[PDB]
Structures are given as C-alpha cells and as structure tokens.
Amino acid sequence: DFQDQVAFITGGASGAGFGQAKVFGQAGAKIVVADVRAEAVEKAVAELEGLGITAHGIVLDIMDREAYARAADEVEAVFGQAPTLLSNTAGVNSFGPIEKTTYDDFDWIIGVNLNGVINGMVTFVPRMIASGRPGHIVTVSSLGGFMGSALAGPYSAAKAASINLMEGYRQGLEKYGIGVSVCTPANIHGLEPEKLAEAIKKGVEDNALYIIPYPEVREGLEKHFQAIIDSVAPM
Amino acid sequence: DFQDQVAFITGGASGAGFGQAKVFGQAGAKIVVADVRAEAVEKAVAELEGLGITAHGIVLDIMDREAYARAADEVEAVFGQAPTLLSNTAGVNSFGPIEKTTYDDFDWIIGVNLNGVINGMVTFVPRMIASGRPGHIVTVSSLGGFMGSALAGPYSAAKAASINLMEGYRQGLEKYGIGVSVCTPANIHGLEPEKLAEAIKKGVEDNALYIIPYPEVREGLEKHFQAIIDSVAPM
C-alpha cells in the first residue's frame, strides 16, 4: 500500500515521529529517520530493522539549512530517489508566562516548530516536483496553532504558522499530484503515538487537509472561531 | 482622550501606520514614527508637526534587535517614559507560487511580518510593565492570517503567527492593565488608511481582541472555519 514509497520523518527517533516510521514502515515504506539525537536515531533504526523495515538514520538539526540539503542528497544516494513522503514532525516546547519570553526562547521554539518546517519544505518540494512522482507532505503541528495561549505562546504561534503554511502548499502543490496535510494533536490520558500515527496514515490516504483525531475539542474550536466571526464589523 | 499617551508605530511613515500616527496624534498622543526609510520618516514627521502633533522620528529596521533596543531607550530619552501604546504595523509582501519560494523570500517576509513583531514585543513589554502604567498593544496583521494561500504563502503564515501570538499576549498581559488587539485587514476598492486607522483606535478604546472592519469577509471566514470543524473526528 506504501510499498516502494520513501518517507523522510523529522523527530522520527521518538514519539509521533517514531510511531509514523513504524506505521508507514509496516505498510511497506522505506524510512529515513531524521533526528538531532544521534544516539536516539541509532536506537530507533535498530528497532525498525528489528521489525523488518528498511530504514536509514540521519543525524540532523533541521534548523541547519545546508545540512538539511546534505541529508536530502544523502537520501537520494541511499534509496536512489527523493522522498515521496515528507513528515515534518520534530517539535519542542517549554512552558512559562508569555511576557517573560526571551529571544533565545523564541529562536529555539520558532526555530524548530516553524523555521524547521520551512527548511523542510524548501529543501524537498523542488526535488519531489522534479521527480515527477505523486507524493505527500504532512506537518504535525498542534491544536494550539488554532488558539494562542499565555503559557505556550511562542509554540502556539509557530504552530499557527505551520498550519497556515500547509494550507497554502496544499493549494500550490495539488497541480503536481502532491497532497498536503497538517495534523493538529491536542497537547495543551492523551492519544498514544501509535494511535496518532495511524490517524496520520489515514489522513494521507484520504488526502485530508486537516487531521484532528480528537472528537473532544470540537466544542472549544467552534467557540473560538465564533468569537472571531462575532468580531466582524456589521453590516 | 489619548492626551499624554506615547505611541510607538512601526511602518508609521506610510499607509496604515501613518494613518494611526495621525488619528492617535489628533486625539492627543505624542507619536514616535519608526520606519526603515529615513527620508519617508522625515517627511512623515514634518507632516505630523504641520498638524500640531508632537512627533519624533526614528529610522529603524525592526529586524535589528539591538537597534530596536536603542530606539526604546531613545523614546524614553525624548518623552521621558516608555510608550503606553505599541503598534506593530510595518509589513511587506511579494506575490508568487508558494512552491517557488526561496529562503530569502522567507527570511525577508517572515522577518518583517513575524520576527519584527516579536522584537517589538520583547523590547517593549517589560518596559511597559515596569512603568506600572496602563497601556495597549496592537498588531496589524492580515485576514490572510486566518487562511493560508498559494500566492501569498510566507506572508499569510507570518500573519497567522502574529494573530496567534497576540491572542497569547492578551491573556498574559490583562493582569497588568495592558490590553492587546490584532487588526486583520482584507488585503488578498479596499478600506482607506485613515478609515482603518479610526477602526483601530476604536478597537483600542473598546479593548477588542480582534479588529475586523470588513463586514464582507464574514461569509468566507465562517466557511473556512467550518471546514476545520468538519475535520474533527467523530464521535
């Protein structure tokens, strides 16, 4: 079903990224695990190979644009083609009062959660297009991207951008047979990494723009959106 | 009504920024015009002084964090206090296919429309808090911040973040008597800079979170938001 697909997953050495490596892997995909923790990568790929998944490990900080370019080249060297599935899953956060936020807080958190995914998009989109093969791109953002917050301020803002940015690329890339989705998990008991992974794979199959496997958030989301609509000036 | 308020306006040498300088100025506010075009600043302040507004000009690229800090100091030197009104209005854009976007496109556009306003917030928020005076903060974002697009991709994403970020700071700063608003103009015939300026001043008075003086967009916004709500997994 995903046989002879190549999937490039950031933050794939853990959590939702690893879950995706596993779930896509079990469907037949060749996996590239891109993560910044060299030790965790090593482990993650051993464990994937243990499961009969063909998997390559790339230690990478997605905030480094030129290494991200080396990786992309590396992927073509190893598997003989650019990825046909890109997953921007790597994320980081830290909690505290939004007024107390510092430049380093911003650079780190905006860095991983927004600039990282831009780097992902700029690196791979032209290669995926030049391949002339169908493809797909998923970004795991966050429910916080739909609503700013006083304790996860920088994180929420970056996620709001990555959601909006995926909305854009969906429109741009449809003409290339490349679908685009954004997953917004509820991280504000809690959906397991493999359960979320299966939701994402389903969304990829369905070519869904939004992947929101949390029936419980609907009320809150409707409320937040109505508050905006109510703000529109009459008449 | 705004007498003995000090207002710091980015991109105030033109368009919606200048409109605000004028409208706040005519209400009694002392104005700081912060803009990157030294010539346009000079002109803008001459024209404000011509109108009986006390106005100071600061040539500034809001992407420079340390100059933004020099400015803030400069403001306290000139008017003897930190601003009691911050307006992050400076913006830039360029149109083209989102897949063709380049790093320089991203750095410039994310730079002004998001990083600029972060720099604005980090610089002034502590000073405004330390003043122990009531205050207010407005960011002029965009309607595109509510919905990603294939031709204004980077711009829309940055604006989505600045909206979300203001949502956050509103919550954080309420306990400090500092209100926060975000204005989202429809720039996707068109509302005049002074008309938008008056809408913003009203929103500041009303302490409104959202300032959306465009009755016509309501249908589209409701539609976009419903599409998201419809994506939430049953049950």
Side-chain angles (χ1 to χ4, degrees), chain A residues 1-188 190-235, chain B residues 1-188 190-235:
Chain A
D1 201 40
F2 286 84
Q3 286 198 90
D4 300 338
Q5 299 253 72
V6 181
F8 184 102
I9 313 182
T10 66
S14 153
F18 184 75
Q20 282 172 92
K22 169 172 181 183
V23 168
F24 290 129
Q26 288 177 349
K30 303 170 179 296
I31 313 295
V32 178
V33 172
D35 201 312
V36 69
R37 302 143 62 206
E39 62 287 359
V41 167
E42 254 186 312
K43 176 187 181 77
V45 57
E47 181 172 340
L48 292 176
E49 289 175 335
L51 292 160
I53 306 168
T54 62
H56 185 67
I58 301 178
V59 189
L60 171 62
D61 178 354
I62 55 176
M63 293 192 293
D64 181 330
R65 284 177 183 171
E66 57 169 82
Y68 212 143
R70 291 193 287 266
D73 287 317
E74 182 168 342
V75 179
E76 296 157 24
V78 165
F79 293 110
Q81 65 170 279
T84 67
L85 206 165
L86 173 59
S87 182
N88 309 107
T89 296
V92 305
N93 188 32
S94 176
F95 292 99
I98 195 175
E99 333 76 73
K100 273 68 170 174
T101 303
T102 75
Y103 281 132
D104 292 348
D105 294 339
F106 277 105
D107 296 336
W108 180 48
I109 293 181
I110 302 300
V112 181
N113 293 291
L114 174 50
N115 295 334
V117 5
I118 293 165
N119 296 356
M121 295 313 264
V122 175
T123 303
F124 279 120
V125 164
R127 301 160 182 266
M128 291 174 73
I129 270 176
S131 90
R133 264 180 293 256
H136 199 93
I137 307 170
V138 212
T139 295
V140 173
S141 178
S142 175
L143 194 76
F146 287 132
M147 36 178 63
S149 76
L151 291 171
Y155 176 87
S156 297
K159 293 308 198 193
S162 69
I163 294 167
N164 181 286
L165 188 64
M166 289 308 108
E167 291 171 337
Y169 274 102
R170 184 171 177 82
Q171 280 168 80
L173 297 180
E174 163 167 310
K175 50 177 182 278
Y176 297 106
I178 304 178
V180 180
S181 314
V182 57
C183 183
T184 67
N187 46 342
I188 303 191
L191 216 70
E192 273 280 296
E194 213 193 326
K195 271 69 153 50
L196 180 60
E198 292 174 34
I200 292 174
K201 176 167 85 90
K202 178 65 172 170
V204 167
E205 295 164 341
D206 286 7
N207 197 20
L209 168 51
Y210 307 108
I211 308 179
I212 318 175
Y214 301 81
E216 51 271 355
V217 305
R218 189 151 174 157
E219 203 176 16
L221 238 38
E222 288 177 321
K223 183 168 177 59
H224 172 78
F225 289 162
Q226 190 63 33
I228 295 166
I229 267 53
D230 286 353
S231 288
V232 181
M235 56 235 62
Chain B
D1 201 40
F2 286 84
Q3 286 198 90
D4 300 338
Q5 299 253 72
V6 181
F8 184 102
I9 313 182
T10 66
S14 153
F18 184 75
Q20 282 172 92
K22 169 172 181 183
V23 168
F24 290 129
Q26 288 177 349
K30 303 170 179 296
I31 313 295
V32 178
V33 172
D35 201 312
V36 69
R37 302 143 62 206
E39 62 287 359
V41 167
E42 254 186 312
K43 176 187 181 77
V45 57
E47 181 172 340
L48 292 176
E49 289 175 335
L51 292 160
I53 306 168
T54 62
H56 185 67
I58 301 178
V59 189
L60 171 62
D61 178 354
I62 55 176
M63 293 192 293
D64 181 330
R65 284 177 183 171
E66 57 169 82
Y68 212 143
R70 291 193 287 266
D73 287 317
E74 182 168 342
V75 179
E76 296 157 24
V78 165
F79 293 110
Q81 65 170 279
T84 67
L85 206 165
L86 173 59
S87 182
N88 309 107
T89 296
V92 305
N93 188 32
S94 176
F95 292 99
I98 195 175
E99 333 76 73
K100 273 68 170 174
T101 303
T102 75
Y103 281 132
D104 292 348
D105 294 339
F106 277 105
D107 296 336
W108 180 48
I109 293 181
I110 302 300
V112 181
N113 293 291
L114 174 50
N115 295 334
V117 5
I118 293 165
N119 296 356
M121 295 313 264
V122 175
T123 303
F124 279 120
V125 164
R127 301 160 182 266
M128 291 174 73
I129 270 176
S131 90
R133 264 180 293 256
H136 199 93
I137 307 170
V138 212
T139 295
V140 173
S141 178
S142 175
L143 194 76
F146 287 132
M147 36 178 63
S149 76
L151 291 171
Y155 176 87
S156 297
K159 293 308 198 193
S162 69
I163 294 167
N164 181 286
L165 188 64
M166 289 308 108
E167 291 171 337
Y169 274 102
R170 184 171 177 82
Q171 280 168 80
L173 297 180
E174 163 167 310
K175 50 177 182 278
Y176 297 106
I178 304 178
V180 180
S181 314
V182 57
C183 183
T184 67
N187 46 342
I188 303 191
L191 216 70
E192 273 280 296
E194 213 193 326
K195 271 69 153 50
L196 180 60
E198 292 174 34
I200 292 174
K201 176 167 85 90
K202 178 65 172 170
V204 167
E205 295 164 341
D206 286 7
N207 197 20
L209 168 51
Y210 307 108
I211 308 179
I212 318 175
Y214 301 81
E216 51 271 355
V217 305
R218 189 151 174 157
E219 203 176 16
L221 238 38
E222 288 177 321
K223 183 168 177 59
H224 172 78
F225 289 162
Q226 190 63 33
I228 295 166
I229 267 53
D230 286 353
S231 288
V232 181
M235 56 235 62

